Subunit: 250 residues, 4 copies
């Protein structure tokens, strides 16, 4: 029957665009969310109106804790319960905010949220995906600017660097099971809702190819390629989708 | 009406698969060749039987010399003459052989072939392509996923492939204002050299994590087709490995 | 006055050689340890015999937990209480063991130990070091891994922690450059091998190394640390020096 | 006896600072130069006054040509003829100027100068150095910290510095069995070009996180001195950035 995919943080923005394009391609989808319950249920409604019984939501907090392994097992189990299989995992959910080294959240909360969502949750989701196991693959949303990082984002950048490590280590370890593991690395795509217009335009003007941010759909297009049969020899690769931003010197 | 692509070294192996798959996607194609005239014409005959007047051949030596710039200008010119436009350049042609540092062809001939075909010809072709320019214009360079874990005694070849990464990044930056994207595809082990013995071929296949086999030429071509497509319109300066995980494997 | 350095995991092997060479260079040293108290104290006593009042020990578990930030603050504070200054931090301590993705510690313990020692503790130590600073040559050296992009099979959590440490090295280099604090790494390939590893297995690794078919001594790793903290490296920040005999260049 | 080193492009700037610091460490030096004869001889005179018979000059044009191999052979031979040994090779000489892809030297001259000096001459010197061996032998290549974030319109220069990364890695691998280590030093901004106005210099200076200033020549030479030293005896195939953080700064 139709393959099934889990997309984390799929209620809004890039994860929503990935869930939509997978669904358009033929997948049944689990729409994971944390706080955005109305947007999650609304997307599932839209996808199920298009093909009945092809979308479910699954709520979970991907902050690191001693129950995060159970939450990640539950996300994968939700896909098997709804659809009887789980072919694709997209690790899209992410906390993103500054953590300056020199001075409402305590530092161990910042560690738990930024390292948990960007790295530890992907690892545990990978573990659960592999253990429960056509064209199986995992796509991790990485960051094209990981080696040219934003000032005062050390914990975020540590998380994204750890996600590169996971993409490589899991590609190596899961290749014998036919599971491919790859990444998509945006530069500037949909800018943070909290950011003012002048700051957004500052970022847009840095991008060589068009002086504009990527659409969510342009990031989703690279995800679709990597899960497709046109990528069946590709594993351990991270595709930058940044309009050349990472090539630009200071 | 139909876009047009140039593929260098297109008579055989990976460049032939790239030309076939572009043609199948609806491109008109220039099949460039150096020594493989019969094979080049055989492919053009096959593509033209499918759709008339959609494939031409172009002979050129891509060794570095005083005449390489004129030759590269002629390859690009052939596409404009045949088809009225040139939307895609695939730099696929490549010399590959060892050049030991501690001791046939003189060393400066080895330089001209390994650095000329793998790096200088792509640079000159890129200059000609850009100078002659809605549209979806892009260049794809055939790179090598093992550029940082090179084969023993292949220094000039490795130098040429590293220079091609530099051209990919430099040209992506400089041509972005013209809407020209520049990207790479980096195979690991794909079609093994004809000269290689069967036992040595098997030793390499056994190293690959994903299925213990080499990439087909069509699996390499699939990544080229993605990068020239509308699904890659924000991608420039990216090199996609297509290596089955081989570059992740420690010694 | 003599400058002062904190070296984590300094009782044995590479951290011990780093602490010895820094002391030989004229630093006073805090020898941090977790379980190896006898070896830590034996080194501090040897160092104090060479020059009185130039070495102290500091015990702490660097596993991630709610108390890790306090522990890491106390390690930096110990250097200021002993010596009145803290010029150099070497993030050397590390947990290292396989964590297979597929079928007696729980996975959250594995996460706490591998990501805590290799990445979170270095970040918290870096925060505490910088906060206490806000003639001088201040720097941090992180012990990285030359094989981070060609990792050992079934070491995903170890490899994630060492990739996070590359990120820390780069992010902290950029953010601390205004304060004159340089942040660099040294990335061994194969150095001192596990103690009870059979010679026949040690030889399998040694034979992979192009330069000399042998592992690095601890002292060879320490030499790169000494260069990075020296006045000969005063424009170097954000750099990771491989000390791996060419091992990372070797294809499968 | 004292060891001996060749430094290419050593009459001025960074290559002079490297030759001076090697000479202060106890090396005998060959000061290679191309056009800077007055400056080369003046430096050798200063070093000879300090310790007699410890410095010679050697003239050569490192542009690629069919005689570049003989010129490279002769630079290494100059060191054996003056001092009876050659322990260290520093590949410092470099051409640097823009080569825009979209438009008085011909393009083939630009290729010969920018790829010859930055990549092929280091390769041929590496071959000559290795073949003349019968101690702590090493080669240091002057690379560029900004090779992955290149200056607009410098594609040939960037190609040559990428190829020099490939040579560094390939030669470290291949020469390790002979005990020759091969490493790189990668400046960001150091001594700015003499042609550059102060306003333009300050634009570059302000980009550098560590001190908002360029590296001194002596700071670059310090990293060379470390890599040839006994404190780097297990280091091969490493490129050390000396860039004050510049390569970490986003656009
Ligand atoms: N946008 C860009 O320019 C850009 C650039 C580089 C990289 N990326 C990467 O691309 C991916 C998608 O980008 P984006 O801008 O779409 O992401 P985003 O809107 O910042 O975050 C995506 C979703 O992550 C979920 N999330 C955050 N904290 C969580 C937690 N503790 N538990 C569970 N889920 C949590 C949130 O779900 P709820 O709303 O349900 O709470 C959120 O809507 C991310 O991995 C990002 O780092 C994006
Ligand atoms: N096969 C692999 O496993 C592999 C692995 C890594 C990277 N790659 C890269 O992928 C690309 C395609 O690989 P491949 O195995 O298909 O290549 P290949 O068969 O070695 O060479 C492709 C064509 O290059 C042309 N060529 C060689 N020297 C030339 C010259 N002096 N002037 C003009 N053309 C010349 C030849 O055309 P004529 O036959 O017409 O003379 C040859 O058929 C190459 O860039 C290669 O470096 C391949
Ligand atoms: N040896 C190599 O070949 C090699 C290769 C690549 C990278 N490296 C890196 O180089 C550095 C030094 O290597 P090494 O072989 O000397 O290290 P090691 O012997 O594996 O570990 C060093 C010390 O880390 C401390 N440590 C472990 N878990 C800890 C925890 N939970 N809390 C606090 N401290 C803890 C231990 O201190 P106690 O003994 O006091 O408990 C141990 O003595 C490490 O970062 C390592 O990853 C080494
Ligand atoms: N300066 C920086 O900020 C910086 C930044 C990044 C990388 N680097 C690298 O660091 C190294 C030293 O930099 P620099 O500024 O000192 O170099 P430079 O002054 O630009 O060039 C050094 C010497 O190269 C020689 N050279 C040029 N063309 C030559 C040819 N055709 N044949 C033989 N020699 C030739 C010249 O010797 P004569 O004067 O004798 O003709 C020149 O004095 C270079 O490799 C450079 O690319 C420097
Ligand atoms: N989870 C998310 N990760 C990232 C990563 C990068 C970006 S766009 C670049 C950018 C850079 C700096 C700031 Cl302060 C901001 Cl708000 C945004 C946006 C997001 S959203
Ligand atoms: N132009 C070409 N470049 C390359 C690069 C790699 C390969 S397969 C890997 C490989 C590795 C080692 C040897 Cl000795 C040989 Cl012949 C081939 C085949 C080709 S054909
Ligand atoms: N804390 C530590 N980190 C590292 C990283 C690498 C190495 S040597 C390589 C190596 C690789 C695999 C195995 Cl199983 C073993 Cl035991 C040793 C040894 C250590 S000790
Ligand atoms: N052989 C040489 N290579 C380089 C590389 C960089 C630099 S400094 C930065 C810089 C950057 C851009 C321009 Cl246009 C100029 Cl003129 C100078 C100076 C030199 S000198």
């Amino acid at each position: 029957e139709a393959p099934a995919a889990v997309v984390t943080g799929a209620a809004k923005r890039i994860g929503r665009a990935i869930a939509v394009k997978l669904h358009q391609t033929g997948y049944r989808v689990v729409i994971h969310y944390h706080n955005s319950a109305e947007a999650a249920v609304s997307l599932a409604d839209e996808l199920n109106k298009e093909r009945s019984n092809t979308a479910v939501v699954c709520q979970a907090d991907l902050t690191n804790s001693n129950v995060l392994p159970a939450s990640c097992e539950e996300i994968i189990n939700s896909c098997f319960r709804a659809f009887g299989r789980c072919d694709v995992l997209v690790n899209n959910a992410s906390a993103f905010y500054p953590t300056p080294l020199v001075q409402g959240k305590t530092v161990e909360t910042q560690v738990a949220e930024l390292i948990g969502t960007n790295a530890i949750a992907p690892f545990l989701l990978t573990m659960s995906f592999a253990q429960r196991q056509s064209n199986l693959s995992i796509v991790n949303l990485c960051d094209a600017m990981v080696d040219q990082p934003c000032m005062a984002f050390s914990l975020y950048n540590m998380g994204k660097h750890a996600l590169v490590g996971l993409t490589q280590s899991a590609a190596l370890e899961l290749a014998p099971y036919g599971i491919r593991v790859n990444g998509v690395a945006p530069g500037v795509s949909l800018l943070p809702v909290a950011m003012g217009e002048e700051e957004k335009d500052k970022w847009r003007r840095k991008v060589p190819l068009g002086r504009r941010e990527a659409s969510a759909e342009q990031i989703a297009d690279a995800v679709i390629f990597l899960v497709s049969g046109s990528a069946q020899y590709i594993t351990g690769s991270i595709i930058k989708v940044d309009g050349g931003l990472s090539l630009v010197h200071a």
